[PDB]
Design a protein around this nucleic acid. Structure first.
Length: 496
DNA sequence: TGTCCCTTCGCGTCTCT
DNA sequence: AGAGACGCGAAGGGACA
C-alpha cells in the first residue's frame, strides 16, 4: 500500500475493488471513509471477514460494517464485534445497533470488552440502566470512562452531591475519564471559591474537553469577572458551550471587539458560547468591517451569523456567496442572513446555491419556499430530502407541495419527511387519521419523534390508555410532540 | 503504521413551546 | 422564533509499539 511496495498497492486496490462486490456492495465514499480513518488494515480486515460480518449470528448491514471499520483500530473492533456481539445481546440484553454504537469509535475493542466486563456491576451495584452504560461506552476511550464511573460514581454522589444522571452526563463524552476526575478535583473550589452551583459545573463538564473547560474556568473566571466585567453566568455559558479555547479568546479579544468594533459584551459572549467560539470570534474581528462596509450588513446581522456552531464557516461562506445570491439569484441580504443564521449555515447557503434553480424548475417551487426550507437548522438536509421525496410524497401519498414544504420548513425537516414517508400509510389506513392530521403532527420541530411516538401508542396501546381518543392524541402530539405524549404516560402511571 | 485516548470544531435535530 | 439543549462525527494531536 505504502510507497513500500507497488505490487502491494495493486493488491490493496484489488481488495477495495472486490468490496464493491456482492456481500457489502460498498461505494466509493464508503471505501474512502474506511481508508481515511481505519487505514489499510481496516480495509483489509473488512475484506477478509465480509462474509462472517454479514451472516452468521451477526447479520450486520454494510453501513454498520463501515461504521465499525472506520476508526483507529478498526480491525480490532471488527474482530471483537465478531466475538462479543452475540453475548452482549443475548446475555446483557443490548440490541445490535447498540453494540455497533459501542464498537464505532477509536479503541472499540476495549470498550466492547469493558462493557462485557462491567455493565452488570454498573447496573446492579450502581443502579445505572443499560442505555446509560451504552452512552458512556460509545465514545473514544469508553473503557476508561466506564472504569472511572465505576470508581468515582459513589464519591461524586455522596461526597459532592451529584446525581447518577449527572455523573453519566459527564462521562458520556470523549475524555470522560478526564472530565470526571476533574470534576472530582475542582467541584469544591469552583463552588465555594467562585460561587458556582454544582449544576453549572456539571454543565461545564458535560462536553468533550470538559477537563480543559473546567481548568480554564478555574483559571480565568476571576480575570473575566473582576477585570473585564463579565458575570459568572456568562463565563459559565462560554465555558460550557465554547470551552477552553473560547474562554481564552474572549480574554484576549473582548477589549478589541468592544472598544474598536463597538460590540457589547453580551454580543461577544454570544459569539463565544458555541463550539468553535474561538474561531467565530477571530472571524468576526477579521471580516466584521468588510461585511458592514462592502456588503452592507449590520453588526447585529454579523453577530447573528457568528452566533452558532460553525459561525466562522457561515461568515466566510456569506462573504463568498452573498454577492452571487443577491445579484444572480435575486435573494435579499435579509434572506441570506436567515439562511446563514443556523447551525450548518455554510451548508445551507452552499446547498441553496446549487439547488434553488433545480427545486423551482424540476419541482415547481417558488424561491420563497426554498428560502423557507433553507432558513432552518439542517437546511442542506431538508432541501435535499425535499428533492428526493417530493415526487413520491405527492404522487404516491397524495400530499400537496404546500404540505411537503410545511413539513420541511422546521429543524429536522429531513427527519420529519422521511418519517412521514414511512408512517403515513399506517396512520391513515390502519388508524384512520387524515393526511392533514399527520402533516400537522409533522409540521413542528420534533416531527419525527412526535410521529413515532404517536404510532407507538396507537399500535401497542400503552398503559395510559382510555379517554385519549385518536384525535386527542393527534392534538396532543401537535401541541408538544413526544414530550407531551410521554408526559401523560408518566402522569397516569401513578395518578390514575 | 496501528492502536488507544483526548480535544477542538462543525453539522444536524429536538426540547422546551 | 429562537435559544440552548440534545446527539453524532471528522479531524488532528500525543503516547507508545
Amino acid at each position: 500500500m505504502q510507497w513500500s511496495g507497488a505490487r502491494a498497492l495493486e493488491a490493496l486496490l484489488t481488495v477495495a475493488g472486490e468490496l464493491r462486490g456482492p456481500p457489502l456492495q460498498l461505494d466509493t465514499g464508503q471505501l474512502l471513509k474506511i481508508a481515511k480513518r481505519g487505514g489499510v488494515t481496516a480495509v483489509e480486515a473488512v475484506h477478509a471477514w465480509r462474509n462472517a460480518l454479514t451472516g452468521a449470528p451477526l447479520n450486520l448491514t454494510p453501513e454498520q460494517v463501515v461504521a465499525i471499520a472506520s476508526h483507529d483500530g478498526g480491525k480490532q473492533a471488527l474482530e471483537t464485534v465478531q466475538r462479543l456481539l452475540p453475548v452482549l445481546c443475548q446475555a446483557h440484553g443490548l440490541t445490535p445497533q447498540q453494540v455497533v454504537a459501542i464498537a464505532s469509535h477509536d479503541g472499540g475493542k476495549q470498550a466492547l470488552e469493558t462493557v462485557q466486563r462491567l455493565l452488570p456491576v454498573l447496573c446492579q451495584a450502581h443502579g445505572l440502566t443499560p442505555e446509560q452504560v451504552v452512552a458512556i461506552a460509545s465514545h473514544d476511550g469508553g473503557k476508561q470512562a466506564l472504569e472511572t464511573v465505576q470508581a468515582l460514581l459513589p464519591v461524586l454522589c455522596q461526597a459532592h452531591g451529584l446525581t447518577p444522571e449527572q455523573v453519566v452526563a459527564i462521562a458520556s463524552n470523549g475524555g470522560g475519564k478526564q472530565a470526571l476526575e476533574t470534576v472530582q478535583r475542582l467541584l469544591p473550589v469552583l463552588c465555594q471559591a467562585h460561587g458556582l452551583t454544582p449544576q453549572q459545573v456539571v454543565a461545564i463538564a458535560s462536553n468533550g474537553g470538559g477537563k480543559q473547560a473546567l481548568e480554564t474556568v478555574q483559571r480565568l473566571l476571576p480575570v473575566l469577572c473582576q477585570a473585564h466585567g463579565l458575570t459568572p453566568q456568562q463565563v459559565v455559558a462560554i465555558a460550557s458551550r465554547g470551552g477552553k479555547q473560547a474562554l481564552e479568546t474572549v480574554q484576549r479579544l473582548l477589549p478589541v471587539l468592544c472598544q474598536a468594533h463597538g460590540l457589547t459584551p453580551q454580543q461577544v459572549v454570544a459569539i463565544a458560547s458555541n463550539n468553535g467560539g474561538k474561531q467565530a470570534l477571530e472571524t468576526v474581528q477579521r471580516l466584521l468591517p468588510v461585511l458592514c462596509q462592502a456588503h452592507g450588513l449590520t453588526p447585529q446581522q454579523v453577530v447573528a451569523i457568528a452566533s452558532h456552531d460553525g459561525g466562522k464557516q457561515a461568515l466566510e461562506t456569506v462573504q463568498r456567496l452573498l454577492p452571487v445570491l443577491c445579484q444572480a439569484h435575486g435573494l435579499t441580504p435579509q434572506q441570506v442572513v436567515a439562511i446563514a443564521s443556523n447551525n450548518g449555515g455554510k451548508q445551507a447557503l452552499e446547498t441553496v446555491q446549487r439547488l434553488l434553480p433545480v427545486l423551482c424548475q424540476a419541482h415547481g417551487l417558488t424561491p420563497e419556499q426554498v428560502v423557507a426550507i433553507a432558513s432552518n437548522g439542517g437546511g442542506k438536509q431538508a432541501l435535499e430530502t425535499v428533492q428526493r421525496l417530493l415526487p413520491v410524497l405527492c404522487q404516491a401519498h397524495g400530499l400537496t407541495p404546500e404540505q411537503v414544504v410545511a413539513i420541511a420548513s422546521h429543524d429536522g425537516g429531513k427527519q420529519a419527511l422521511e418519517t412521514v414517508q414511512r408512517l403515513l400509510p399506517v396512520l391513515c389506513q390502519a388508524h384512520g387519521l387524515t393526511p392533514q392530521q399527520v402533516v400537522a403532527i409533522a409540521s413542528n420541530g420534533g416531527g419525527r419523534p412526535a410521529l413515532e411516538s404517536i404510532v407507538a401508542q396507537l399500535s401497542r396501546p400503552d398503559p395510559a390508555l382510555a379517554a385519549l381518543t385518536n384525535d386527542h392524541l393527534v392534538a396532543l402530539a401537535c401541541l408538544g410532540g413526544r414530550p407531551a405524549l410521554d408526559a401523560v404516560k408518566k402522569l397516569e402511571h401513578h395518578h390514575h
